């Protein structure tokens, strides 16, 4: 039910994004000893690229329908998106935290990359258990619902026969609210760390505009995509295109604000 | 001090040995001049209808 | 021995006061109080010149009634084309503290001075494209208050070290020194013949000098406070006087005494600039209470109020043709009315 | 209706005002201070690392994030009411007091009483610098400070004498929008730029709080 | 103040050359410099223009799409890069300075030209071989396709004198304003589309070709040239 | 309907909170000229307290059941919740923005003039966005109280079952659109608030600095909003639980915010009242990172 032209346009855009991701990964894995790239924690950024490619793969996985294994498909793509945005937004807050600590606590007077990776791993483990409880307690079982409903609002009586087919959990709002809440608290502390590391250093090493535009875009994208997924599900081309577009714009935007200053500073050196 | 006193004595003689008028026309010349030159001055009766020196 | 000289001086000044009193028959009252009133004068904001980033301390009009010179505390001397609200030159000043500016009648030179005790002249018409210093005049021991051009070679400057001097630009020397004025000389005005000029000072005296000579000829007296402004009549036989006691007067050269005084009961701020109309009938006086009101030089009448300045007005100017009046305050914006 | 010469004149005007805006942006980040005091009251050696640029003397130096400018205003024997309004927008007034000269102490007190109540200096804060403290403390044994300042009791010690002089100086202050910053300093004290920097940034913060309706 | 222009020479009919001129004596950034060509046996023609700070760059009709002008303000050098040089570009190229404010005198200095060999408003003025007698009243005329008066009260027309073997020198600007260094015998007056340079008491160092210029509409128009004999 | 004991304890707690708010209002009005209250923004504290009493009245109206036009009651409780949240979290952000501009514009001259009228204008713009969103919600898709009986014959992967579900809910037809809109606008506002709390993290003493109150309030706001959305959506068979949880969440959030704002002012009011010898008494209030 998906038009081939829309599918091709989306796949080409996501392939261009993935090629840019691979180019960034090669740049940050080759120029490790360069002063500019080493100043911006090159070993942490590999986690960001892995999260970015995971999100792009999930955006691809939104592009297939029509298989009784749709449930596994939706669970894999949603869990992949969750783990991907977790891995994207981990190291940015970690770098901001380390920059704040070396700016503040060094004045009265050192954090290694392993400590920030441990914080990132704890955050991923939280995401893993929060997804495991969802996939174990109530699955995303697809059911064919046929029902007749009588509408009596107190002034008129009418009857409606609805045959609605959808794929959703028994209590989907609990899981979306809890994942929303955990990610929102994370983005709130990220905005706090962005404020703390405000006008502290150069944008190649100071991640303040990057995290702010990423948090704002993540909030607006999540709201818009949840709205267009819940209500206008009878517009499958629109839902697929908007979901893939939101994921592509977000992932590319954060990755570009992370790595464009690095390449700009490397061009002059 | 003595030089300053001599300078004051000489200077105060300069206004002493001259006088001009007892306001016989010393105020009539003002009212004569302002009446004739009132048409020349545009600060009293401006005419921004065809000239328009400023917009 | 100084007692006899002091007694002789006291007798001479008593004779002078008696002569002024006896010559004051048919006085300022009921000699000009027989004509029609000036009326109601309202001037609208035609121009609002902007471009300074400090307080404007001086302003002089060109003799073509087209170009202005405004020198401010920001170290910049902007020459304004008033007809199109336009900038012609911007001269960076070596010393930013500036209290005066002048415009040569030929349109070729502008002058500037301030707390550096230097009247620095500038050449506008040069075959290099930019305004350069032509000569720096130094030699006073006090700050310069007002400079006025006679021609392209002679400048006369009023300074605060109890002296005035006439220079020559070519050699940079003081040709004539005008000794007197025990206070600080605060303003200066040139009569329309380049022969005689007035100069008020802080010791409450408005002397009249001669350019071709080096001594005073009439020492007007009567103010009880500091002076700040002075301006000749178009005839060349009278001059106005603005002062710190909220009292603007008109004096008379022939009578050697004081004509009608246009003061108000509620006004207490000092006068900073006075100017005359083309005919001399309208007098514009600056005020330190964020205002600049007009009067009549013959009768006492507030013919109008020119308001709109956020800070104190320190420079007021009326063009040679009398077509427009320029009003500059410390709000970094100077205005031209009609 | 514009001609070609008019258009190029407008372009020249735009260049002039753009360079004016650039100069105003560059010059806004310079702190302006007004040095004052009596004769030989330590004005010439307030900062040992300053570069000098007559009517008035201007000396400038740069410390950390700001550029400083000082106006010695020495030799201006004219009336101190006609050019004070030139120095109306200064951020602070550095008053230098020499505790050594007992004869000229009352001159410094009179000047402080004059400048702290002027109409143009109602809001401008004052950084006092009680200079020459070393030889003052050396000579405080012979002179008990009551020869020049009566109506006080004390042990004729250095600390109490300095406190009394500071109290007399702050007694001439009648203003609810001004704070006088006092700092005793030596002739051998290299730490003078940091004192002025701390006082000036405190003054700027206080002025910003005043302008917003707060303190 | 002196303008020296360097470059030029032979070129293949289809090649390219990059003429360059430099100034030494006046503030370069305050002047809008022009390029004016002269065919070896014809009048003058405007080519290129760059403003102060490169804010406005104008070209002629035979110059648009083929030539370009650049200036190097830190090094005080003006560049003329020409491409596709036809045989109609065989001309001597002059570098002209111009300043623009109230009371300015544009086109007040000309540099010595560069000989190049490649192997609207219409103005036509007077005769071309007038018999000038030393000491007389000579009224060289001019004409235009429009009344060259603007609402600013400034009528725009410029008079140039080209001595034999020398660059043009400005005589009269606006309509009746003497340029600096021009003797008082030179005087001009006129009205819309009717201009006359009245030279009284003719003397030596005045023989040559006299040119007009319009400066209302910016694509510049000259005249053919009136030549003073004897 | 609802249990009387729970209604009594909720009303008692809300009355105690409202009396605390009125006491804080009396302290702000009385000691407005005290130096440390003047170094805070008492006029903006008035707006915060007005939002606090609005959201306390919202929590009061959450208990009103079996009385009405209940469809209008839902509108008039949620609208005043949203307006109260705007009025509470506006002035704190404005105060933090003034602190950031005052302490990070250390240029000679050019003093910042941010009067209280500008910040009331910013709060008015935020409230204008609030009222246009609420007007669109009440005009396009109003909440209607509808009772529907229905039967559903669903089929699983291998089983067929039939359920007869009859429910009565009073909710919008496009409810999640309005929830996403208003929570999203509030989310952007609170993320900028977290940014301002970060920027002003070590700018002054806790009487003037509002970093901790912004961070605590924003975390509690997200937690309360998520929990109350879930328990309102899925627990209609437990009216006492949802009523108590909503009232307790509103009370806890508003009380912690107002306590964090006003308790340090009351603690440090004495130290800047009587003597006030020099401004060295307030040196930590001029601090900087
Ligand atoms: C770093 C760049 C990444 C940015 C990308 C952010 C965009 C996310 C949009 C994708 C999610 C929309 C999918 C809608 C749910 C769905 O598929 O339906 C199945 C169902 C919801 O069904 P439903 O409600 O859509 O349709 C049924 C309607 N009905 C009335 C019948 C119930 O989802 C669930 O079962 C619950 C599981 C939750 C999955 C976790 C969400 C993943 C979102 C990834 C972003 C994480 C961070 C963002 C959090 C907030 C940030 C502040
Ligand atoms: C400063 C401290 C303030 C603390 C207050 C924070 C707590 C807020 C709890 C709100 C409780 C919602 C009550 C739901 C009522 C209801 O059922 O309406 C029916 C509908 C939804 O119905 P329903 O889903 O709840 O139940 C019916 C179930 N059914 C499946 C049949 C639909 O709600 C709406 O339509 C609301 C429209 C939007 C109105 C917005 C309300 C304002 C919320 C508070 C202000 C914003 C502050 C929070 C933002 C923070 C962001 C992280």
Three-state secondary structure along A182-243? Answer: HHHHHHHHHHHHHHHCCCCCCCCCCCCHHHHHHHHHHHHHHHHHHHHHHCCCCCHHHHHHHH
* Mutate-to-test residue for ligand 1 from A168, A187, A232, highest number of ligand atoms within 8 A of CB: A168
Q: Whose CA is nearest to atom 36 of ligand 1?
A: A172
D122 CA to centre of ligand 1 in angstroms: 63
Q: Is F254 in the pocket of ligand 2 (CB under 6 A)?
A: yes
* Residue C134 to residue D197: CA distance in whole angstroms: 41
Q: Which domain holds residue C328?
A: 1-337
Question: Per-residue b/e over E163-173, b at no fewer than 16 CB within 10 Å?
Answer: eeeebbbbbbb
Q: CB-based contact (8 Å) between E25 and chain C?
A: yes
Judge F/B contact: 3 or more CB pairs < 8 A.
no
A221 CA to centre of ligand 2 in angstroms: 21
Of C22, C28, C215, the CB nearest to B27: C28
Of E1, E30, E103, the CB nearest to C130: E30
**How many CB atoms sit inside 10 A of residue C155's CB?**
24
* Residue F31 to residue F274: CA distance in whole angstroms: 13
Kindly give the interhelix angle for F70-103 and F239-268, rounded to the nearest 10 degrees: 30
**What was the elucidation method?**
cryo-EM
Q: Strands C282-287 and C291-296: what pairing?
A: antiparallel
> Residue C41, Cα to own-chain centre: how many angstroms?
23
Burial zone of C87 (CB within 10 Å; 0-12 exposed, 13-18 middle, 19+ buried): buried
- CB contact under 8 Å between D28 and F111, yes or no, is no
- The answer to whether the CB of F116 falls within 8 A of the CB of F40 is no
**How many CB atoms sit inside 10 A of residue C238's CB?**
25
Structure tokens that stand for E124 in this block:
């036509």
Contacts of A132 by beta carbon, 8 Å cutoff, 6+ apart: none
- The answer to whether the CB of C234 falls within 8 A of the CB of C192 is yes
A251 CA to centre of ligand 2 in angstroms: 31
A79 CA to centre of ligand 2 in angstroms: 27
* Residue F254 to residue D70: CA distance in whole angstroms: 52
Of F105, F108, F286, the CB nearest to D30: F108
DSSP-derived secondary structure letter, E52? G
- CB contact under 8 Å between A231 and F177, yes or no, is yes
Residues whose beta carbon lies within 6 Å of some atom of ligand 1: A 55, 74, 78, 81-82, 85, 88, 134, 140, 166, 168-169, 172, 175-176, 179-180, 183-184, 187, 218-219, 221-222, 225-226, 229-230, 243, 246-247, 250-251, 254
* Residue C285 to residue C241: CA distance in whole angstroms: 9
* Residue F180 to residue F171: CA distance in whole angstroms: 15
Which residues of chain F have a CB within 8 Å of the CB of D205?
A: 102-103, 106, 286
Least Cα distance to E168 among E117, E217, E222, E130 occurs for E222
Give the closest-approach CA distance of D12 to chain F in angstroms: 29
The number of folded domains in chain B is 1
CATH number at residue C197: 2.130.10.10
- The answer to whether the CB of D118 falls within 8 A of the CB of D85 is no
* Residue A51 to residue A53: CA distance in whole angstroms: 6
- CB contact under 8 Å between E101 and D12, yes or no, is yes
* Residue E76 to residue E4: CA distance in whole angstroms: 11
Give the closest-approach CA distance of D3 to chain E in angstroms: 6
DSSP-derived secondary structure letter, E179? P
- CB contact under 8 Å between C23 and B30, yes or no, is no
> Residue C180, Cα to own-chain centre: how many angstroms?
19
- CB contact under 8 Å between C74 and D24, yes or no, is yes
In the numeric block, the tokens 């304003």 are attached to: E177
CATH number at residue B34: 4.10.260.10
Which residues of chain D have a CB within 8 Å of the CB of F106?
A: 65-66, 201, 204-205
Q: CB-based contact (8 Å) between C97 and chain D?
A: yes
Structure tokens that stand for F243 in this block:
């009523």
Give the closest-approach CA distance of F40 to chain D in angstroms: 7
- CB contact under 8 Å between D213 and F39, yes or no, is no
The number of folded domains in chain C is 1
Give the closest-approach CA distance of E181 to chain C in angstroms: 11
Least Cα distance to E117 among E138, E140, E94, E86 occurs for E86
A176 CA to centre of ligand 1 in angstroms: 6
Looking at the DSSP bridge assignments, the partners of residue E19 are E80
Q: CB-based contact (8 Å) between C184 and chain D?
A: yes
* Residue A102 to residue A80: CA distance in whole angstroms: 34
* Residue A109 to residue E97: CA distance in whole angstroms: 64
DSSP-derived secondary structure letter, F30? H
Q: Could you tell me the domains of chain D?
A: 4-209 (3.40.50.300)
Least Cα distance to B33 among C324, C278, C24 occurs for C278
A171 CA to centre of ligand 1 in angstroms: 13
F183 CA to centre of ligand 1 in angstroms: 16
H helices of chain A, where?
4-30, 35-38, 42-61, 70-104, 113-137, 172-196, 209-230, 236-267
Subunit partners of chain C (3 or more CB pairs within 8 A): B, D, E
Number of inter-chain CB pairs under 8 A, B vs C: 138
Q: Which atom of ligand 1 is nearest to the CA of A176?
A: 38
Q: Which domain holds residue B40?
A: 1-55
Q: How far apart are the first and last CA of chain C?
A: 61
DSSP-derived secondary structure letter, E89? G
Least Cα distance to F215 among F96, F114, F99 occurs for F96
Give the ligand at the shortest distance from the Cα of A171: 1
Of E30, E102, E180, the CB nearest to C127: E180
Give the ligand at the shortest distance from the Cα of A17: 1
Binding-site residue positions of D for GTP: 131, 134, 186
DSSP-derived secondary structure letter, E54? G
Of C219, C254, C259, the CB nearest to B15: C219
Structure tokens that stand for F50 in this block:
């007005």
- CB contact under 8 Å between B40 and C279, yes or no, is yes
Judge E/F contact: 3 or more CB pairs < 8 A.
no
Question: Per-residue b/e over E7-42, b at no fewer than 16 CB within 10 Å?
Answer: ebeebeeeeebebbbbbeebbbebbbbbbbbbeeee
Q: Strands C76-81 and C86-92: what pairing?
A: antiparallel
Best of F101, F184, F189, F191 to substitute, by most chain A Cβ atoms within 10 angstroms, is F191
Q: Which atom of ligand 2 is nearest to the CA of F236?
A: 26
- CB contact under 8 Å between D9 and E100, yes or no, is yes
Binding-site residue positions of D: 131, 134, 186
CA distances, E35 to each of E60, E81, E211 (Å): 10, 11, 16
- Residue E219 phi, psi dihedral angles, 5° rounding: -55, 110
Long-range contacts of A143-149 (CB under 8 A, 24+ apart): A143/F154, A143/F155, A143/F156, A144/F154, A144/F155, A145/F152, A145/F154, A146/F152, A146/F153, A146/F154, A147/F150, A147/F151, A147/F152, A147/F153, A147/F154, A148/F150, A148/F151, A149/F148, A149/F150
F227 CA to centre of ligand 2 in angstroms: 10
- CB contact under 8 Å between D82 and C160, yes or no, is yes
* Residue A144 to residue C162: CA distance in whole angstroms: 106
Q: Percentages helix, strand, coil for chain B, rounded to the nearest 5?
A: 45, 0, 55
* Residue C13 to residue C7: CA distance in whole angstroms: 10
């Amino acid at each position: 039910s998906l038009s081939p032209v829309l599918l091709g346009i989306v796949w080409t855009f996501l392939s261009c994004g993935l090629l840019l991701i691979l180019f960034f990964l090669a740049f940050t894995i080759h120029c490790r000893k360069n002063r500019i790239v080493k100043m911006s924690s090159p070993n942490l950024n590999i986690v960001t690229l892995l999260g970015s490619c995971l999100t792009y793969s999930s955006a691809y996985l939104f592009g297939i329908q029509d298989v009784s294994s749709m449930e596994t498909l939706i669970q894999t793509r949603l869990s992949m998106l969750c783990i991907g945005t977790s891995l994207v937004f981990g190291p940015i807050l970690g770098k901001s935290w380390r920059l704040y600590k070396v700016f503040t606590q060094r004045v009265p007077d050192i954090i290694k990359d392993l400590q920030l990776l441990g914080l990132v791993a704890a955050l991923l483990m939280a995401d893993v258990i929060l997804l495991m409880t969802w996939v174990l307690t109530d699955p995303i079982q697809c059911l064919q619902i046929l029902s007749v409903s009588m509408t009596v609002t107190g002034k008129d009586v009418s009857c409606t026969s609805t045959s609605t087919h959808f794929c959703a959990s028994r209590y989907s709002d609990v899981w979306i609210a809890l994942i929303w809440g955990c990610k929102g608290l994370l983005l709130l502390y990220g905005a706090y760390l962005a404020g703390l590391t405000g006008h502290v250093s150069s944008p190649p090493v100071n991640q303040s505009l990057t995290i702010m535009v990423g948090v704002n875009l993540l909030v607006l994208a999540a709201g818009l995509l949840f709205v267009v997924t819940r209500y206008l599900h009878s517009w499958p081309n629109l839902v697929f295109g908007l979901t893939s577009g939101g994921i592509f714009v977000c992932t590319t935007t954060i990755n570009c604000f992370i790595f464009i200053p690095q390449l700009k500073q490397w061009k002059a050196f | 001090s003595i030089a300053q006193a001599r300078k004051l004595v000489e200077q105060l003689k300069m206004e002493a040995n001259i006088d001009r008028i007892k306001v016989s026309k010393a105020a009539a010349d003002l009212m004569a001049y302002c009446e004739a030159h009132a048409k020349e001055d545009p600060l009293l009766t401006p005419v921004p209808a065809s000239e328009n020196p400023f917009r | 021995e100084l007692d006899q000289l002091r007694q002789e001086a006291e007798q001479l000044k008593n004779q002078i006061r008696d002569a002024r009193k006896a010559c004051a028959d048919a006085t300022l009252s009921q000699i000009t109080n027989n004509i029609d009133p000036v009326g109601r004068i309202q001037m609208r904001t035609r121009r609002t010149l902007r471009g300074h980033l400090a307080k404007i301390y001086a302003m002089h009009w060109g003799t073509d009634s087209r170009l202005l010179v405004s020198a401010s505390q920001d170290g910049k001397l902007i020459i304004w084309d008033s007809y199109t609200t336009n900038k012609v030159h911007a001269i960076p000043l070596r010393s930013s503290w500036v209290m005066t500016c002048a415009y040569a009648p030929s349109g070729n030179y502008v002058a500037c001075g301030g707390l550096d005790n230097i009247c620095s002249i500038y050449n506008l018409k040069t075959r290099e494209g930019n305004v350069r210093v032509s000569r720096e005049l130094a030699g006073h021991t006090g700050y310069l208050s007002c400079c006025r051009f006679l021609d392209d070679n002679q400048i006369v400057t009023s300074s605060g070290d109890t002296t005035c001097a006439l220079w020559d630009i070519e050699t940079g020397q003081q040709t004539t020194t005008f000794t007197g004025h025990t206070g600080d000389v605060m303003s200066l005005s040139l009569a329309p013949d380049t022969r005689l000029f007035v100069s008020g000072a802080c010791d409450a005296s408005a002397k009249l000098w001669d350019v071709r000579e080096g001594m005073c000829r009439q020492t007007f007296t009567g103010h009880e406070s500091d002076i700040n402004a002075i301006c000749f009549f178009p005839n060349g036989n009278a001059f106005a006087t603005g002062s710190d006691d909220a009292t603007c007067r008109l004096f008379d050269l022939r009578a050697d005494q004081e004509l009608m005084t246009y003061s108000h009961d509620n006004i207490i701020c000092g006068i900073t600039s006075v100017s005359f109309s083309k005919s001399g009938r309208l007098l514009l006086a600056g005020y330190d209470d964020f205002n600049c009101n007009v009067w009549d030089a013959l009768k006492a009448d507030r013919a109008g109020v020119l308001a709109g300045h956020d800070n104190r007005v320190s420079c007021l100017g009326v063009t040679d043709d009398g077509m427009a009046v320029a009003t500059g305050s410390w709000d970094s914006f100077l205005k031209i009315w009609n | 209706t514009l001609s070609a010469e008019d258009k190029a004149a407008v372009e020249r005007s735009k260049m002039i005002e753009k360079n004016l805006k650039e100069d105003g942006i560059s010059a806004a980040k310079d702190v302006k201070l007004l040095l004052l005091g009596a004769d030989n009251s330590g004005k010439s050696t307030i900062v040992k690392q300053m570069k000098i640029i007559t009517g008035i003397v201007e000396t400038h130096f740069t410390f950390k994030n700001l550029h400083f400018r000082l106006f010695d205003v020495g030799g201006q024997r004219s009336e101190r009411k006609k050019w004070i309004h030139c120095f109306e927008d200064v951020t602070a007034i550095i008053f230098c007091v020499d505790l050594s000269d007992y004869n000229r102490m009352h001159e410094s007190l009179m000047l402080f009483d004059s400048i702290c109540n002027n109409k143009f200096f109602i809001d401008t804060s004052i950084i006092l610098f009680l200079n020459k403290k070393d030889l003052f403390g050396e000579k405080i044994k012979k002179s008990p400070l009551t020869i020049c300042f009566p109506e006080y009791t004390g042990p004729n010690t250095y600390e109490d004498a300095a406190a009394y002089i500071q109290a007399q100086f702050e007694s001439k202050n009648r203003s609810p929008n001004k704070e006088i910053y006092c700092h005793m300093t030596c002739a051998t004290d290299t730490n003078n730029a940091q004192v002025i920097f701390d006082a000036v940034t405190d003054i700027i913060i206080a002025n910003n709080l005043r302008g917003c309706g707060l303190y | 103040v002196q303008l020296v222009e360097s470059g030029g020479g032979l070129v293949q009919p289809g090649g390219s050359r990059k003429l360059s001129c430099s100034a030494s004596g006046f503030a370069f950034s305050s002047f809008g410099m022009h390029w004016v060509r002269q065919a070896p046996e014809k009048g003058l023609e405007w080519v290129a223009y760059i403003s102060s700070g490169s804010g406005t760059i104008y070209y002629a009709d035979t110059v648009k799409g083929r030539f370009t002008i650049s200036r190097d303000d830190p090094k005080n050098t003006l560049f003329l890069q020409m491409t596709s040089l036809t045989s109609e570009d065989t001309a001597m190229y002059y570098c002209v300075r111009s300043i623009y404010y109230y009371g300015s005198s544009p086109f007040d200095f000309w540099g010595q030209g560069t000989t190049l060999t490649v192997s609207d408003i219409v103005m036509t003025q007077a005769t071309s071989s007038v018999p000038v007698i030393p000491g007389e009243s000579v009224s060289i005329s001019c004409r235009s396709s429009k009344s060259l008066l603007h609402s600013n009260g400034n009528t725009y027309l410029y008079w140039f004198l080209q001595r034999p073997g020398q660059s043009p020198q400005l005589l009269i600007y606006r309509m009746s304003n003497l340029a600096s260094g021009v003797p008082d015998r030179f005087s001009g007056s006129g009205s819309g589309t009717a201009f006359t340079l009245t030279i009284s008491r003719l003397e030596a160092e005045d023989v040559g070709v006299y040119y007009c210029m319009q400066h209302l509409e910016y694509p510049l128009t000259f005249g053919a040239g009136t030549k003073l004999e004897l």
